[PDB]
Amino acid sequence: TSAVQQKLAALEKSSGGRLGVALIDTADNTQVLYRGDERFPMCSTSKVMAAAAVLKQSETQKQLLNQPVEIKPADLVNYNPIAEKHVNGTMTLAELSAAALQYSDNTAMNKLIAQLGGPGGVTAFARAIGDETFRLDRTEPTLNTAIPGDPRDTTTPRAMAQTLRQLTLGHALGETQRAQLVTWLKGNTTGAASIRAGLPTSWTAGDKTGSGDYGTTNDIAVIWPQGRAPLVLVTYFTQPQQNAESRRDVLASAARIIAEGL
């Protein structure tokens, strides 16, 4: 095991939880992995798959993103920063995708799931792009129960890094769609204490965070340094106590360790 792996392991030991990291450097396509093949609860990081899948639909349904979707009072779940603003109104599939990605809105995510025919339809997209590891099983908010050993709504750091790469840097999506996804991720509001906090301040990043029970604290990011090829980094973290507090600082520190290890 490398120096970076030794430092990640020490970080993990200090934290009291379980840490999963995957970095892909698109320069030589080398990967740095820590518990890169263990399952972790995705929590809101799964929102990237649901949004990408609706993007995929729009490559044939050209005005899909502009379609109004009713927000009903019964639609609202535990955390709806944007959707609660449009109750007895409508938001578009574009606005829903933005709200899900940028504010982590759970009602928004449930609309995206419905648009895909259920959690199976989101998993269908993963399979359509070669990700055989991602599984989405539940809707919001129960997908965040993050129960130790539960395989539902999990993926591995290696799979999610490979997927995020294909979506934002690769050609799993049409160009218009990819660029929309990159824009959306770049404008995330929830990520300042996570991966971004561990990165040289002049790097551009887009990311999606996620949190859940068992103090589960996640972030997935595409990163663009300057004068070197982009990176994708996944940092997943979960803890033994059901009511454990969030540890975004762990993700910041994993990303600092990786950033130094380049």
CA 12 to CA 136: how far, in whole Å?
26
First to last CA, the chain: 16
d(CA 35, CA 28): 21
44 is catalytic: yes
Q: Does 194 bind ligand G30 (CB under 6 A)?
A: no
Instruction: Say which DSSP state 245 is in.
Output: P
Give the active site residue among 44, 104, 194, 253. Answer: 44
Q: Which residues pair with 233 in a beta bridge?
A: 23, 221
Interacting residue with ligand G30 among 80, 155, 211, 253 (CB under 6 A): 211
* The one-letter amino acid at 48: V
Q: Which of 17, 36, 191, 210 binds ligand G30 (CB under 6 A)?
A: 210
Using alpha carbons only, give the angle 129, 134, 139 rounded to the nearest 5 degrees. 110
# residues contacting ligand G30 (CB under 6 A): 19
CB of 15 or CB of 144, closer to ligand G30: 144
Residue 6 in the binding site for ligand G30 (CB under 6 A)? no
Query: Which residue is listed with tokens 């949190």?
Result: 211
Tell me: does residue 244 bind ligand G30 (CB under 6 A): no
Residue type present at position 100: A
Position among 213, 231, 234, 247 found at the interface with ligand G30 (CB under 6 A): 213
Subset of residues 84 to 123 that bind ligand G30, contact rule: CB under 6 A: 104, 106, 120, 123
Binding positions for ligand G30, rule: CB under 6 A: 43-44, 78-79, 104, 106, 120, 123-124, 127, 132, 135, 141, 144, 209-213
Q: Which residues are catalytic?
A: 44
